[PDB]
Structure 1
Amino acid sequence: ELLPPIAHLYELPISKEASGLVHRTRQEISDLVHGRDKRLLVIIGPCSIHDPKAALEYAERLLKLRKQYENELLIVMRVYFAKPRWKGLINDPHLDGTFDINFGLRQARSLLLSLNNMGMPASTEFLDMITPQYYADLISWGAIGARTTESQVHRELASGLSCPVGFKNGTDGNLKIAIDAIGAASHSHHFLSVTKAGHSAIVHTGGNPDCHVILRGGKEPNYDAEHVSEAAEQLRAAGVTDKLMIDCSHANSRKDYTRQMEVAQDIAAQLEQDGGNIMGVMVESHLVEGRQDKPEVYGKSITDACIGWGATEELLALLAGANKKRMAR
């Protein structure tokens, strides 16, 4: 029997400091989206969380670099619960085909609260129409994924979220559908949704003004300067923000997780050469590099493969050093 959001919000209410972090981080991000601050948002963390222990451990380390680089970068953890394909730690938290959604949603809120409490903001992918209410309050940045950027109900969903939202270009490279997504997400909508209490209702939303585009490759990779400058023109054409995010992983690195660093080197070049239209990057990253089918090694992905801790330090310093130079000019 499905518990409503209110049951989880009661056991695990947001603390003052988690509340303050989220509010502050959401704003700080807004500033990057509309070009009021020249720091670089870095959404970095695992492809997917399957072990809360590990995620917290990962946070601790990320925390040191988050504060270390705070004048140049704005580091925020990837806390994605799954990959649209095990459909997650939400849909199946025991990793054994048991589908215990009540436990999953509880565990997800708990991890989210714990990270916000220790100073680490959290981002995630909003896939379902109903699950967001259970932890959206703990989320500082949200992704609508390549497979739903074109869906009306997902643009609706984003139009009512209190955090900035990144729309990915379509699976085969289509950029218009993300630009459209911003236009749709920015305006008011009326639609059916589910309340904190678990009842259906008509919601009226006010529009999300802090949406932006995410370049994640396609038929070919769209991360370089020319690809970025073409994106910027199109965004200016449609009267939406020409500041965008580049996903280092997935279809931009193709089938090689270690190529994340090359893309990052290339973004670093742009930032030292000009890079005016870049406000963020995304990186798939974990304690231990690579992937595995079943979860036997601690802190190594069971979905898409991720760079390991060593390379993450490397990749962050690379970008930190690069963006310091852009902020100077």
Structure 2
Amino acid sequence: HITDEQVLMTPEQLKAAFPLSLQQEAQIADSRKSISDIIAGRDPRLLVVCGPCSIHDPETALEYARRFKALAAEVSDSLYLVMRVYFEKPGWKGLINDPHMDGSFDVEAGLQIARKLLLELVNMGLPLATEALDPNSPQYLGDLFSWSAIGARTTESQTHREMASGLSMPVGFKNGTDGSLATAINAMRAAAQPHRFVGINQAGQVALLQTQGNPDGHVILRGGKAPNYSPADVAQCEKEMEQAGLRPSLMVDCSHGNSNKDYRRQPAVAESVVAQIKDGNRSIIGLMIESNIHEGTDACISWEMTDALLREIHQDLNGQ
């Protein structure tokens, strides 16, 4: 049986408690537009989604964000840095479903703390990236992010392509865990179309939502059974995107698939992408980097390696 039934704080109440200013909303809109122009090929800068493997402390996230902002101010001519703020990953639930780390599962406090942290990060003038797992979480925090990613077992799910068609931000779809590009391509094509699904409204009520569709989409080359960052795999992805009637636009993830979840191989992947760009590649739009304060249960690279790698990429991409 069900014993207690206590209403959760609605997205309206949450956004009223922790509100965006008009300036911050304009900044988020500008960053969304810039990322979408990068994806579309109208902006020469390379998109770089980089950040912690997962966020489980606001103070660690703020220190990483200060270092990240200081670095972005120095590589802003060639690279466009976006910080991924990943709370819940697909034990402990990750600061939103359990902010007290004691199984209490205080979801109201978790939502408030996450929104406060994201508001502080946006106030620093930092575009944010996320990976939507809960289809209803973009109703609570989606107004704070400038870029979203759709996952492996999440891409083929139709609920998530509908939610992606409902999102307001540029969006990258990851290929299949078996390396299937067709799933990502089809999710990208379907997210560009209007959709009608069952979600929640801003009053926290179950509702029927209608979506125009998301025209700002791209593929995330994540690697499956084998890495797919080589020029041959990139050309095959371009071929499949052209056959599907889409403009070749892909982001290479230096993380889990293309490095076998090993930290030492991420800079090599980034350097291969840079070399491909030097040889005239036109489809590679961005990179994805998992990087925490220290090296080392995901294998995220150290901050010293992140600084060195982004400096090398910035220094090598000058001619273009």
TM interval, short-chain normalised: over 0.9
**Count, aligned residues:** 314
CA deviations over 1:31-64 (Å, ceiling 9, x no partner): 1111111211111001110000010111011101
Residue 98 (structure 1) shift: 2.3
Alpha-carbon deviation of 1:309? 0.9
Q: Contact conserved, 2:165 with 2:214, CA < 8 A, in 1?
A: yes
Instruction: Identify which of 304, 312, 319 aligns with 2:306.
Output: 312
1:134-145 equivalent positions in 2, closer than 5 A: 134-145=140-151
Q: Which structure 2 segments of 5+ residues have no match?
A: 1-5
Partner of 1:266: 272
**Alignment deviations for residues 242-264 of structure 1 (CA, whole Å, 9 cap, x no partner):** 01101100111003112111111
TM-superposed CA distance for 1:266, in Å, is 0.9
CA deviation profile, 1:263-314 (whole Å, cap 9, x unmatched) = 1111111122222111011000011111xxxxxxxxxxxx412111100011
Task: Give yes or no for contact 2:39–2:216 (8 Å, CA) kept in 1.
Answer: yes
Identical pairs, percent: 53
2:282 match:
276
Deviations 1:221-246 (A, max 9, x none): 00111111110111111111301101
Q: Does 1:166 align with 2:166?
A: no
Partner residue in 2 for 1:150: 156
Instruction: For 1:37 and 1:20, locate their aligned partners in 2 and report how far apart those are by CA, in whole Å.
Output: 19
Equivalent in 183, 193, 196 of residue 189 of structure 2: 183
- Counterpart of 1:98 (choices 96, 104, 111) is 104
Instruction: Please provide the CA RMSD for this pair.
Output: 1.2
Please give the residue correspondences for 1:10-89 in structure 2 after superposition, counting only pairs within 5 Å: 10-84=16-90, 86-89=92-95
Partner SS, residue 67 of structure 2: helix
Which residue of the partner structure matches residue 324 of structure 1? 318
2:14 corresponds to which letter in structure 1?
H
- Correspondence 1:125 to 2:119: no
- What are the ranges of 5 or more consecutive residues in structure 1 without an aligned counterpart? 291-302
Which secondary structure does the structure 2 equivalent of 1:88 belong to?
Answer: coil
Q: State how far apart, in whole Å, the 1-side matches of 2:77 and 2:91 are.
A: 37
User: What is the DSSP-based 3-state SS (H/G/I as helix, E as strand, rest coil) of the residue aligned with 2:207?
Assistant: strand
| One-letter code aligned to 1:319 | I
Q: Distance between the aligned counterparts of 1:10 and 1:234, measured in 2?
A: 45
Residues of 2 paired with 1:32 and 1:17: CA distance?
Answer: 22
Q: Is the 8 A contact 2:150 2:171 kept in 1?
A: yes
Report the Cα distance in structure 2 between the residues aligned to 1:120 and 1:218, rounded to whole angstroms. Answer: 31
Aligned to 2:304, the other structure's residue is in SS state: helix
Amino acid in the other structure paired with 2:135: M
Query: Partner of 1:217: helix, strand, or coil?
Result: coil
Secondary structure, counterpart of 1:324 in structure 2: coil
Give the TM-score of the pair, scaled to structure 2: 0.95
CA distance in 1, matches of 2:267, 2:217: 26
Contact 2:175 2:184 in 1 (8 A): yes
Deviation at 1:103, TM superposition (A): 1.1
Alpha carbons of structure 1 residues 171 and 87: separation in structure 2 relative to 1, 3 Å = farther
Q: What displacement does 1:85 show?
A: 9.3
Conservation of the 8 A alpha-carbon contact between 2:261 and 2:299: no
Contact 1:47 1:82 in 2 (8 A): no
Q: Match of 1:107?
A: 113
Using the alignment, how far apart are the partners of 1:196 and 1:315 within structure 2?
42
* 1:93-116 CA-partner distances (Å, limit 9, x unpaired): 222322111111111111111111
TM-score, length-scaled by structure 1 = 0.93
The whole-number CA distance in structure 2 between the counterparts of 1:187 and 1:68 is 38
Q: Judging changes above 3 Å, is the alpha-carbon distance between structure 1 residues 126 and 255 closer, same or farther for their aligned structure 2 residues? A: closer
The 8 Å contact of residues 18 and 117 in structure 1, kept in 2 or not, is answered as yes
